[PDB]
Amino acid sequence: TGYVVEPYRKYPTLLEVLLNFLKTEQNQGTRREAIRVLGLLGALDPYKHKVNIEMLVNMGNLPLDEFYPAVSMVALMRIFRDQSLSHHHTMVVQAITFIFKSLGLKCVQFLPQVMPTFLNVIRVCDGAIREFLFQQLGMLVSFVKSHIRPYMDEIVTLMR
Amino acid sequence: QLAACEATELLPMIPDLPADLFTSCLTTPIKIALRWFCMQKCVSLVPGVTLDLIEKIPGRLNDRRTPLGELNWIFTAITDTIAWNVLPRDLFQKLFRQDLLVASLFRNFLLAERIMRSYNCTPVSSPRLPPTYMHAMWQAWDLAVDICL
Amino acid sequence: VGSDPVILATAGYDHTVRFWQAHSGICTRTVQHQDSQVNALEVTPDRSMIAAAGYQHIRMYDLNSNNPNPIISYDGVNKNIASVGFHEDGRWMYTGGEDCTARIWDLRSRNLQCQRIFQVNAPINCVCLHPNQAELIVGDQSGAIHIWDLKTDHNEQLIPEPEVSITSAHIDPDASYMAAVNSTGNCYVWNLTGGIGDEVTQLIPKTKIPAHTRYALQCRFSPDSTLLATCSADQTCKIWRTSNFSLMTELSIKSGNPGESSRGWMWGCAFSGDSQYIVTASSDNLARLWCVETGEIKREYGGHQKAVVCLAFNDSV
Amino acid sequence: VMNFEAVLHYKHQNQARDEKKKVTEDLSKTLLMYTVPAVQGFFRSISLSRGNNLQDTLRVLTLWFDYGHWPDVNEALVEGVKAIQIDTWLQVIPQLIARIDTPRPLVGRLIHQLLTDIGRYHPQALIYPLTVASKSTTTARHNAANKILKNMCEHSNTLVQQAMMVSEELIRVAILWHEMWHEGLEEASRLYFGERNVKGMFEVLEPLHAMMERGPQTLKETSFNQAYGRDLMEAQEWCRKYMKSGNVKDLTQAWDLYYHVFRRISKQLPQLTSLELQYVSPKLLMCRDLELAVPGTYDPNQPIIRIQSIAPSLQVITSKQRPRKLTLMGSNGHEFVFLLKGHEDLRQDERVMQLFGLVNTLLANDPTSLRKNLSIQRYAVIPLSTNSGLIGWVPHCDTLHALIRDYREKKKILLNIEHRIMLRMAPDYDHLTLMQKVEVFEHAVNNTAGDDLAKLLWLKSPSSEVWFDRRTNYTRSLAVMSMVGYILGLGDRHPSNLMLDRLSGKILHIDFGDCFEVAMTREKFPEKIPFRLTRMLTNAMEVTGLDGNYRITCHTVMEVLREHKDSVMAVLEAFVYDPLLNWRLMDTNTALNKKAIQIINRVRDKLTGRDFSHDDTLDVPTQVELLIKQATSHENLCQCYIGWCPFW
Amino acid sequence: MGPQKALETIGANLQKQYENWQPRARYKQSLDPTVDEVKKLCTSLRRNAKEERVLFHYNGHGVPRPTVNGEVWVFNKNYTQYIPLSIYDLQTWMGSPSI
Amino acid sequence: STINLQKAWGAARRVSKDDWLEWLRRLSLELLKDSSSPSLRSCWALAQAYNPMARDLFNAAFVSCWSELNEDQQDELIRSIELALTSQDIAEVTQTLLNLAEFMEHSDKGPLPLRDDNGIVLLGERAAKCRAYAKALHYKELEFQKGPTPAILESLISINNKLQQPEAAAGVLEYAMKHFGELEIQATWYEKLHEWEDALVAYDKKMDTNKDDPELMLGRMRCLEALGEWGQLHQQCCEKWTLVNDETQAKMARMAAAAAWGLGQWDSMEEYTCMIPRDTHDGAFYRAVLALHQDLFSLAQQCIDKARDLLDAELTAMAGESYSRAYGAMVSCHMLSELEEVIQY
Ligand SMILES: Nc1ncnc2c1ncn2[C@@H]1O[C@H](COP(=O)(O)OP(=O)(O)OP(=O)(O)O)[C@@H](O)[C@H]1O
Ligand SMILES: [Mg+2]
Ligand SMILES: [Mg+2]
Secondary structure, eight states: OOOSSSHHHHHHTTTHHHHHHTTTTTOOOHHHHHHHHHHHHHOHHHHHHHHHOOOTHHHSSSSSSHHHHHHHHHHHHHHHHSSTTHHHHHHHHHHHHHHHHHTTGGGGHHHHHHHHHHHHHHHHHHHHHHHHHHHHHHHHOOOOGGGGGGGGHHHHHOOO | OEEEEEEOOOOOOOOTSTTTTHHHHHHHHHHHHHHHHSGGGGGGGSSOOHHHHHHTOSSSSOOOSSSHHHHHHHHHHHHHHHHHHOHHHHHIIIIIIIIIIHHHHHHHEEEEEEHHHHTOOOOSSOOOOOOOOOOTTTHHHHHHHHHHH | OOOOSSEEEEETTTSSSEEEEESSOOOEEEEEEETTTSSEEHHHHHHHHEEEESSOEEEEEESSSOOOSEEEEEEEOOOOOOOOOOTTTTSSOEEEEESSSSSEEEESSOOSSSSSOOOOSEEEEEEEEEEESEEEEEEESSSSEEEETTHHHHHHHHOSSSHHHHHEEEEEEEEEEEEEEETTTTTEEEOOOOSSOOOOOOOOEEEEOOOOSEEEEEEEEEESSSEEEEEEESSBBBEEEEETTTEEEEEBOOOOOSSSOOOOOOOEEOOOOOOEEEOOOSSEEEEEOOOTOOOOOOOEEEEOOOOOOEEEEEOOO | OHHHHHHHHHHHHHHHHHHHHOOOHHHHHHHHHHHHHHHHHHHHHHHSSSSSSSHHHHHHHHHHHHHOHHHHHHHHHHHHHHHHHHTTTGGGGHHHHHHHHHOOOHHHHHHHHHHHHHHSOTTTTTTTEEEEEEEOSHHHHHHHHHHHHHHTTOOOOHHHHHHHHHHHHHHHSSOOHHHOOOOOOHHHHHIHHHHHHHHHHHHHHHHHHHTTTOOOOOOOHHHHHHHHSSHHHHHHHHHHHHHOOOOOOHHHHHHHHHHHHHHHHHGGGOOOOOEEHHHHHHHHHHHHSSSSOOOOOOOOOOOOOOOEEEEEEEEOOOSOOOEEEEEEEEEEEEEEEEEESSSSSHHHHHHHHHHHHHHHHHHSSSSHHHHTTTTOOOOOOEEEESOEEEEEEESSSEEHHHHHHHHHHHTTTTTTTTHHHHHHHSSOOOSSSSHHHHHHHHHHHHOOHHHHHHHHHHSSSSSHHHHHHHHHHHHHHHHHHHHHHHHHOOOOTTTSSSSTTTTTTOOOEEEOBBSSSSSGGSSSSSSOOOOOOOOOHHHTSSTTTTTHHHHHHHHHEEEEEETTTHHHHHHHHHHOTTTTTTTTHHOOOOOOHHHHHHHHHHHHHHHTTTTSSSSSSOHHHHHHHHHHHHOHHHHHHHHHHHHGGGOO | OOOHHHHHHHHHHHHHHHHHHHHOOOOOOSOOHHHHHHHHHHHHHHHHHHHBBOOOOOSSSSOOOOOOTEEEEEEEESSEEEEEEEHHHHHHSSOSBOO | OOTTTHHHHHHOOOSSSHHHHHHHHHHHHHHHHHSSSHHHHOOOOOOHSSSSHHHHHHHHHHHHHHHOOOOHHHHHHHHHHHHHHHHHHOHHHHHHHHHHHHHHHTTTTTTTTTTTTTSSSHHHHHHHTTOHHHHHHHHHHHHHHOOOOHHHHHHHHHHHHHOOOOOOOOHHHHHHHHHTTTOOOOOOHHHTOHHHHHHHHHHHHHHHHHHHOHHHHHHHHHHHHHHTTTTHHHHHHOOOSSOOOHHHHHHHHHHHHHHHHHTOOOOHHHHHHHHHHTSSHHHHHHHHHHHHHHTTTHHHHHHHHHHHHHHHHHHHHHHHHHHHHHHHHHHHHHHHHHHHHHHOO
């Protein structure tokens, strides 16, 4: 049909979505095809791209003692979102629980990152896992103590 | 001696109470007594009473014939009663009658013992009082306040 | 202090005025100048007392008498006093302001006011006095050498190079050549049509000397008028000879080292009576003394704790 | 524009013949042939930009305003004004409101008829401009503005009576009674002890006594009046007993109580760090869901983000002028933040921001420059009176002064090392000649290194290809606001009045209070610079130096400014032939129309390279070079005020 | 309020609250006090009241929690360090009729 | 804590892509086990089972280790890093060590003690190999900071031009003209500046005086194709083949194929294309192009599709930092998928 460059206006995210496939998908027909696509849509003047449109300085911000937990927490939570967790839920949550156990009450700073995803995981996931997640939720609860109060509604909804 | 909390326990961090909780009980009883009334499930049956209304209760703590003074006057009667029906006579005299300020503190301390309970604290006193939190004259106060606001 | 035929004095940012001696360099005595620094000194022309052009205030200390604080205080100049001069008889002092106003100050009669003024555009750097005591030469920070007649009230402006702050000036005791020196690093020589009885007072442009790379800061002729010494901000004091205008001598206080990030500039110089020794001041605490023939450091007057800007050097009987 | 340039040939070429009865009528014959087809034409090029016509629209104004007192330009203007989309004029309202009081009869009535139309459609857009016009001093403004607000009340009374109240409450918050008393008293003490002036000292104080005669309107004013309303009443009594007797023995009793509250209030203001809005202004706390839009948000092509509710308490920045950090929950939900300033006329800022609007337009339409992201970082400014206004706060920014301070303390560098070197060498640094001070300046440059900005611009970037873009943008940006800054003539650019975007890297100037060489002529520390291109900022560019990105970006900019000089004049003539700003230039000595014409002479000069040498015509590379030399010369830099920070 | 205003004010309010229950007493409030400050204060109140009862209200939300050693926390002159204060020392300075 | 680490440090007896990557994998995981911080130790368990967990913590993991280790142990490690960069340019081992090296500069820990400069010269080389031009410039300027030379400036104007930053290149030239007023060997400089006519003058002069060199010709050929001149470039190829080596002929033949293709001389093109190595993108491309003139689509389609699979790495190295640099590779795939449309046309 000859629908070219125009797709970078209409559904403009497209370039970011395609250039992940070249840096992820382990097939030299899929990685092969993703090039056939990019080509056929054509190249963009990077100014046209900037119209159509952390991790290192994550060290830069902090002293090192606080750095390490923050990095791990970010990597863990980047997995902690459906597709990769289909196998590796349990692993992630075992790490987190060990992190908070290790930190003391300085763990509290990570709460708003973890907790919203965490509770949504419980509702979403299969019952194969679910009895484990509650064991570990209760573990988070214990280290954090009273600071969990903001999320308590959601927890009670989950339990109920 | 008078002490906010037991040796184990930590004081409450609860956003709507003051951080001064044991002092405020001891020396502004009516002000927290009313605010603490408002935070219970008791208020389910006093509709149209918010914390804003309790800010502006008219009267003062000396003019007996004005809602604030009335509650204050009641309060005094109640705490003095809870002490006189609980403590042995010698001890009651020592604390509640000998001198003004101590008597005022221990009267009010009874209120603290009742409140701070509901937030996992227990106050402590050097002449050790018995537990008065359950004593039925409190449920009189509860009604008295209810009507009076 | 007064008794020595070579009175040398020196000062800058250390608040002291130190009195050296020529042969040895044992410090005779020192005097305080608090509240300020010293922009330039001069001795009065009968060796009687010495001037210290401060910020807001000239003061004058006794050279003959032993250990005083100032005899005379003049204020009434609401910025720096950037130069002085003196009437060779010893009645007047011809000052220059940072406030664009080259005054006259009577020495004998006490009067806190000035006798005359000569207002121009920019701040007044140099105030040098022509030998017959009738003309006064005032430069400034916009190129402009104004020649001001003290008798007739005439003022004839004169721009050698556009805009560049002409930093200092002097005219020889012969009245044959005048030299003023600018911030570009050029020393401009002017031929005198010597206006004695006529007031012709015309100048004929002789030579632009590529004198220095950086700021030239003070130029002076010797009493011989064979030699024109030009101090600078390349830590140098290049002596020029009168006939050619060729580099006869090049004094330098450079390091002799690939890394020495400005030891300090070569501020002000002043010849001897015979013009064989040339003193100089510097911004590394060292008032020196040289040999004009060769360029050999005959003495070194190191006593100041902070920097030094101005000299006061004196041959006369 | 051929017809417009032909018009300006026989205007300017005739004043050459004329100045240096019937020569104005022959002119009025010759001009009129072209003046009218210029106007007719522009209307078609405005109706075929429709989204990009600020340049074109300002051309129509230059014509209307100046050659509209003819009836035959009036005719074509009238016709076009009825034809053109009423959207278009929104972009040029400041120019229109500035001439709302025209002594020309026929022009002024057409303006009204246009503003009353913009008042009909897009009312939001107008009311804040009109409200500051409304409470003017001069008669033909405040009659005509209050007139249009009356004619604009029966479209939208609900809208105006909101917006007018909001406005008048925001000003009660912007300065509190005890501030007004503190600044009033300190100025009063300068008059009677410095100058010895007594009648002018009453002129200072008694408008505050007239303020306090109204009585406590809000809780904080109640607590002023209860704390010290009495003292001030009594000091007023004694200063009024001076006006019948004329003894200094009255006055000593008054200055007792005046210094009394002065010292008390001076001991209070350091701790007023945040203002609980109930105490200061209850109407705004009470305010929920105004139809009136969030200030400096209104777009004719967007739906209105309206004031859902004002935030309950205000953070107070500590400076000379103690600005508030006011914030509004808009009806889209989002906290919008402002900064609400007392004692500064922000109509300069308003117009200057309009100018950058023009420049960004010009630079974006040259394709060579478009590519390069030459874009001035303009924020929003909404005046509320002559004495106050709001200013759109900027996200992801920090003053150089803050960056450098944070870096210096991180790596344990003593903050004022440069100033301390200078003082350790020469203790009397202020009290030196020029040449002496150049010594000391150079010494303290040649012992530190100015890597500080250059270094932290890399430490704070994540990756290198980020850092690269940051620094490329940083340079070009800093050049564009050199050249634009120069023209405007934008004084006092010390390191707390400019700031770095911690994302894009771009620079962003703030505070346009010192404009058109106000700073160049002040009688203590007159600036000698065009723009700060100090060594620190220099080191942060590519290691080669100025000769790449920065110098080449100056030419690129200055080709574009010297090209379209007439657009740039139209915009600047606004706040020059508006009387109510230009008192700023009357204060240069220790009359106005002459002084106002001096500015616009000056700016015509910078845009013709007839700036340095009135006789010569300095072509663009050459003009730029002389400027760079000026800005970077150590004589010029060490004359600057010590807190200007020239050794950064 | 900003720190210093708040602390002074709280001393005023706390005094006003005790004035209801006892309006005829000397109320000597100490605000973020040093050890030596407290010593001067308690001993001074002894010599005034001399045989009769003396209140000692101690708040301590600013300081860390009191130790098993029998030490309660106050400040040093510069406000860097929480200094401790032995209860034994405190009941030395305060008299026997006390609360 | 280090005896298990030592197995993954200098196990650098590696030769193919898979061999070096598997060095990297095992290294990153070996780091995570050790790392003294409990909040990384934790992840190891996961880091095996999901490898991008180790990938992303690599830099962080590395500092947690490196912070502890002995001086002997630091040099032991660094010597295998030196060797990992030096021996074998793998996109995803260089771009993980360069990004580790850059991570190390923002740190309190100091930069990596490589080869006495803090490795500036080494790391800059290998950024310019990767087409990591921005990083390449950071280090190139770090050289400049310790006393510049004509060689530094020469490169520094090409690299600025490779970032498409010509005002900065022109600036660097105006540094040169002040301080190195004589040194001015600008035959390569004009060529790097994108002053292609003046470069052709300077290489005309330099090939008149000195002999028929291959290097002067390669530059003077690059001048012609950058001008556009096809007729003249086909002359500069024809004459010099036996005088030229076979190593230079791999560099040369790419320009030659485009030139002969320029002039509709296909027989010549066929000869030159074979000289280009098949495992490169370019070789695959021109083979495919010849095939399209000849009319052999099966073969062509295979070569196209082979080229894509080789291009994978060029698009996988660039775009990991910025799309702007990816843009080079983007034009190639544009051509390829258009190459496909040539068949269909
Ligand atoms: N538009 C803005 N965006 C972000 N920050 C701003 C803005 N305007 C001002 N600020 C910040 O607030 C501070 C004070 O602002 P400003 O300089 O306008 O107030 P001021 O009291 O006039 O200060 P000064 O005494 O320097 O004139 C500045 O140092 C700046 O960091
Ligand atoms: Mg400011
Ligand atoms: Mg300001």
